[PDB]
């Protein structure tokens, strides 16, 4: 229990972090490059990783009176990031941290589980108490600064010398194998925090004006000489394009749409991104997926603002989290969240006490009557297949695929037991869509109803170790971007959808919404749309 120097504690913290907090990155390195044939490269990778960790720890623990709190914070952050990068195989980018800071406690509670609590207690709390309960003496500023540079130069040498000795190998690694650099913790969380702070500063310094894109958008015919239109655009949460029956699936997860005539499903739809906060604004922005920037998504003009300005009253009935920045320029009286029982009349039908999606159709007739004569776009948000709790997104009426994964951890349930729960939640989504279609049909005698559904992103369910959405748009698996798309309309409105095999992306949503109300804007007119 003799007084230990701060520098040996810093080195021990760096060793512990490089040993325990980089399990996924080390496994990926040892599985891409076998240890039996790439001994030198893997050894240099370990050495440079330890050097980077030591450099990071020495730079943020420069002071003496903040050494212990900074070490505690680094240990806790490393453990909390490493658990999620290990079990769920997720990385940390600016978008991932943005999603992390836009969450509600209800969603966070599902991620919390006994195994995660035990792993932090063992990896970022027990070392926390070990570090906080030892005695450390700070020498004079001269010798302390001398030893600090010595450590700085040692870490810089351990970083650079393996790079120079393995110049070609590391050049190839940094040119071709970029994504592995995102699996290292807690360095990647620190870089993401810095980048996010820069983005937030740029957003704050940005003006508070609207960059217009559809100033020339004019309605072809007003809702006085024609039958007024009414579109229920069902924003979809997690769903996979290959898990629907129409595009090929052994099980029948969409039986209630087969008996509904007029439903057209497109087999190839690629979403804008793998996260809801990054995909929902991209659905409604006039910029395509190659130009859309999430940092300025809310400032740019969306199709919703154009539709509201042109005279089409709009309604949003939130269910999952929030409009994510798209329903902001319109009056608050139109955005009505349905997460809590204060608004959703259909709840407490399950032991989990969750409010379902079918309750969002209770009271739409009041809005229809209040808007008797004008176009409406009643957009509905879905809870969908939101994880890691697929078993809580459906009622026992749809408990058709047995067994189901009732556990809170995906790594323990077998693949079939997770597939069953996911498909049951898909069945619940199917039932919601069918009920929406029937509600549209009951108003056919006075409106030209139409329905459009598209999910914001896909899901990973065990392939290559990934288990949840959130991967960066640059190298995300295809299963996180393949989303189903359905369009149904009455056989008298004269709306002809495209072929089922047409290749479309999330950029096709705005042209479809504009074409539904016969609005032509040169900013988006030359884009593929779900309908002719």
């Amino acid at each position: 229990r003799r007084s230990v120097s701060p520098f040996v504690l810093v080195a021990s913290v760096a060793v512990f972090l490089t040993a325990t907090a980089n399990l996924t990155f080390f496994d990926k390195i040892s599985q891409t490059y076998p240890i039996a044939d790439n001994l030198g490269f893997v050894l240099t990778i370990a050495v440079v990783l330890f050097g980077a960790m030591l450099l990071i720890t020495t730079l943020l623990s420069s002071y003496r009176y903040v050494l212990k709190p900074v070490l505690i914070l680094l240990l806790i952050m490393g453990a909390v990031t490493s658990y999620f990068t290990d079990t769920y195989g997720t990385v940390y980018d600016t978008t991932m941290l943005q999603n992390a800071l836009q969450t509600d406690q209800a969603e966070t509670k599902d991620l919390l589980n006994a195994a995660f609590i035990m792993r932090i207690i063992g990896l970022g709390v027990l070392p926390s108490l070990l570090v906080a309960f030892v005695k450390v003496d700070y020498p004079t500023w001269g010798k302390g600064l001398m030893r600090r540079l010595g450590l700085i130069v040692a870490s810089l040498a351990l970083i650079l010398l393996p790079v120079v000795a393995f110049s070609s190998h590391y050049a190839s690694f940094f040119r071709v194998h970029k994504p592995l650099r995102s699996y290292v913790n807690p360095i990647m969380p620190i870089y993401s925090v810095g980048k996010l702070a820069s983005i937030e500063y740029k957003k704050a310094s940005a003006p508070k004006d609207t960059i217009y894109h559809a100033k020339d958008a004019v309605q072809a015919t007003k809702p006085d000489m024609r039958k007024p239109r009414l579109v229920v655009f069902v924003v979809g949460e997690t769903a996979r394009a290959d898990h629907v029956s129409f595009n090929g699936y052994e099980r029948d997860t969409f039986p209630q749409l087969a008996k509904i005539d007029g439903v057209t499903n497109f087999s190839n739809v690629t979403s804008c991104g793998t996260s809801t906060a990054y995909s929902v604004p991209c659905m409604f922005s006039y910029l395509g997926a190659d130009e859309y920037d999430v940092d300025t998504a809310k400032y740019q003009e969306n199709v919703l603002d154009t539709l509201d300005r042109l005279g089409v009253s709009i309604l949003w009935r939130d269910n999952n989290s929030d409009s994510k920045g798209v329903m902001d320029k319109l009056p608050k009286a139109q955005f009505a969240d349905y997460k809590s029982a204060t608004n959703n009349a259909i709840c407490n039908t399950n032991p989990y006490n969750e409010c379902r999606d079918v309750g969002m159709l209770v009271g739409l007739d009041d809005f229809v009557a209040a808007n008797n004569g004008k176009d409406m776009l009643i957009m509905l948000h879905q809870m969908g297949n939101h994880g890691p709790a697929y078993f809580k997104r459906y009622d026992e009426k749809f408990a058709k695929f047995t067994p189901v994964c009732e556990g809170n951890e995906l790594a323990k349930c077998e693949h079939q037991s997770l597939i069953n729960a996911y498909d049951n939640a898909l069945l619940a989504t199917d039932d919601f869509i069918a009920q929406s279609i029937q509600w549209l049909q009951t108003h056919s005698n006075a409106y030209d109803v139409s329905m459009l559904y598209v999910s914001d992103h896909g899901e990973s369910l065990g392939e290559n170790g990934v288990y949840l959405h959130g991967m960066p748009n640059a190298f995300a698996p295809k299963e996180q971007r393949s989303v189903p798309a359905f369009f149904w309309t009455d056989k008298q409105t004269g709306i002809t959808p495209m072929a089922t095999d047409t290749v479309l992306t999330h950029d096709a949503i705005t042209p479809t919404l504009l074409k539904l109300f016969d609005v032509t804007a040169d900013k988006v007119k030359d884009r593929t749309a779900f309908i002719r």
């Epitope: 490059y33 790439n38 490269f41 393995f166 190998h169 190839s172 290559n464």
Partner: antibody, heavy 123, light 98 residues
Framework: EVQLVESGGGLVQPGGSLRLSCAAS????????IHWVRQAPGKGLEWVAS????????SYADSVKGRFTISADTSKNTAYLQMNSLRAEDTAVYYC?????????????????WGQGTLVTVS | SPSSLSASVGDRVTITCRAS??????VAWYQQKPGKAPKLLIY???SLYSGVPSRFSGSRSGTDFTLTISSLQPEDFATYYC????????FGQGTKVE
Amino acid sequence: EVQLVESGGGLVQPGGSLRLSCAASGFNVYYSSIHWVRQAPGKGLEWVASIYSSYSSTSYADSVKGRFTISADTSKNTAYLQMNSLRAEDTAVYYCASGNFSSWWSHGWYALYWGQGTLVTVS
Amino acid sequence: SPSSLSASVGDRVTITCRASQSVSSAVAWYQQKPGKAPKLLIYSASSLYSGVPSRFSGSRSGTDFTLTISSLQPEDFATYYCQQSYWPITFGQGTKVE
């Protein structure tokens, strides 16, 4: 050992379609590397595409761009190259070749093992 | 299109390929037998792959990479292709010996 074998040849018509398979046996798992190199009859080798299944990063050789699209089934350890709108020049023998292993101070990442090749004849 | 450049046999041979991109760490040669799949002989433009007792040595000279075979070739007589860059990949025009 590595046993990359190819399947899905046969006769096709111009403007048709085809879909090949590769990556049999365990070899170096499956993910990362593995390419596609074709050879016209009595002509030198020409690179077609390079899948990097894991990161969803692919590439094409211009003359085969806009019609070719590579899929990847890691569950079954098999790579697929989807061909659409074939023309007369597309006739060739198609191989698939991985790349891995660097020893020490030697690098690597080359199209090292291949297969017997599947003839793709258009007419 | 193939080319029978050396066409000498029974002595050392030298075949050159012009690398538009330097990428000296991503240059390799392949021995394609007339009916079989190509071999990998000589990689990284300076190293050797298992399967030959240093017959094919290989070397570099500025932007031009050449292949050298030292011993006589009673078994060989195949076609060799230079391979420049890995992402993307371009192959040379090929060579033949007789």
